[PDB]
Design a protein around this nucleic acid. Structure first.
Ligand code: NA
Lengths: 185, 178
DNA sequence: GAATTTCACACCTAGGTGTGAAATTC
DNA sequence: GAATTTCACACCTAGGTGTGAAATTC
């Protein structure tokens, strides 16, 4: 159709996804890396929208890193998608959302109910980021949802795959101290 | 019904008594203290934007002579970054203009150009988004008057800045050490 | 000269990284 | 016993302070 939400920097995302991506969750909440950013077109420049982010459980079980490989390791469990995170620019005009990429750089993932906007995930479960565009002031309350398969990841309390850790060190600026340390060897 | 009151007024008057001063720089300088207001009496479900500008507090240039201050169009506006937003949001917690930058030359976004050694009064405006009538409220805060400067001149003001602005903790610590 | 502005600087606030040892968990 | 979670730590990014010598204006 006319509404288009495209993943930005999809090739960085794909490098993580080849290895099976992992996202740290902590007690106090952990930012994602890479950050989910999208390009939006086809909105009404003059309408009002809010952007929401939640995380759909990518399957019905859990996951285990056994001998350098991820292994389905659970008996089936229920349904729940996560709570929602509201993009901080919400609410805003379509034109604002279309002028630059919509970046969810401040969402924090956690493994505990204490949500200052934090998204509680279940460790060792796999998730698929999903973005909702909510039209504000609409008597029909129209909402459109987009999933981003290349951003799937497994929530962990510590990195399992050492190749993931290396990629995170390579590209996340807040991890630069470990990057420079590897270039020292 | 619509009320907009100054937050942390007593920290402002401590500055006000000494004649308050705000640094401007080429790029842009944050205010200290930060202007924060409480809002009540908005429609919780209506959409509003909050705007900030600065009005001339008098007609004189100023200069500092032996420990005393002796003896102009409105500034551009700064839109609070939470705009646009529901009345509920503006009312749930103080509205704080913590990221506005005061400058002597516009060279970037989020900046208000003032002209140095003049006295200015902050003014806040509220507008309803989509209001078919062109309707604005304005709210002045004489307690927050100040003189723009490129360097502090009353040493007593600098002392208060160092005492209360957390980003100047290195100079507070230093003086405690001496 | 005297008055006002710019600047590089040291030192903070504020907060995001993975590490690795220890605690917890089943 | 061993998988999972916790958490104090060093080391970053990012950027807000006043300072004082230097530059600019007057
Ligand atoms: Na400027």
């Amino acid at each position: 159709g006319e509404l288009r939400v495209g993943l930005e920097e999809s090739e960085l995302w794909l490098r993580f996804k080849e290895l099976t991506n992992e996202m740290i969750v902590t007690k106090n909440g952990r930012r994602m890396f890479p950050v989910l950013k999208v390009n939006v077109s086809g909105l009404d420049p003059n309408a009002m929208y809010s952007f929401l982010l939640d995380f759909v459980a990518a399957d019905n079980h859990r996951w285990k890193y056994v001998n350098g490989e991820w292994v389905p390791g659970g008996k089936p469990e229920p349904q729940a998608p996560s709570c929602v995170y509201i993009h901080p620019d919400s609410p805003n005009f379509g034109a604002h959302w279309m002028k630059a990429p919509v970046s969810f750089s401040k969402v924090k993932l956690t493994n505990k109910l204490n949500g200052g906007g934090q998204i509680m995930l279940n460790s060792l479960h796999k998730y698929e980021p999903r973005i909702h565009i909510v039209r504000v002031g609409d008597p029909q309350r129209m909402i459109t949802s987009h999933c981003f398969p290349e951003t799937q990841f497994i929530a962990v309390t510590a990195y399992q795959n050492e190749e993931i850790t290396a990629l995170k060190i390579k590209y996340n600026p807040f991890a630069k101290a470990f990057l420079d340390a590897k270039e020292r060897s």
